[PDB]
Amino acid sequence: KETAAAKFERQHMDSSTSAASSSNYCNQMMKSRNLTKDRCKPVNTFVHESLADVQAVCSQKNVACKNGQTNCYQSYSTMSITDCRETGSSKYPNCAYKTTQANKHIIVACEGNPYVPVHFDASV
């Protein structure tokens, strides 16, 4: 089993690039981060900022999560992100994704000591 913090890093962190490198970025990343193993994860966002900057969001703007939880936080600044979503021709195990680059605020749920992100809620 993964820790919640480690699962967040695997699913959502990509500090190795400033932005998605091509239209094939999501197909490659969803596969290599093991999000196409048991099924095609339908939707997933990657954040192209340092781990430190993303972890810092847990000390920023406290807001509600979409489900009503009170431990969500919105980044004060916008961040480079890539949205990955399954597209029409996608059929497990042949997963297919649309890559959309953007620059916006991220909202994450935080837990633990240290208090770190454990869920990606949305971007604004």
Cβ–Cβ contacts within 10 Å for residue 114, how many?
Answer: 8
The CATH class, in words, for 1-124 is alpha beta
User: Rounded to a whole number, what is the distance in angstroms from the first to the last CA of the chain?
Assistant: 31
Cα separation, 44 vs 30, in Å, equals 8
65 contacts: CB under 8 Å, gap ≥ 6: 71, 72, 107, 109, 119, 121
- Give the technique used to solve this structure: X-ray
Task: Report the catalytic residues.
Answer: 12, 119
List binding-site positions.
Answer: 7, 10, 41-45, 66, 85
List binding-site positions for substrate.
Answer: 7, 10, 41-45, 66, 85
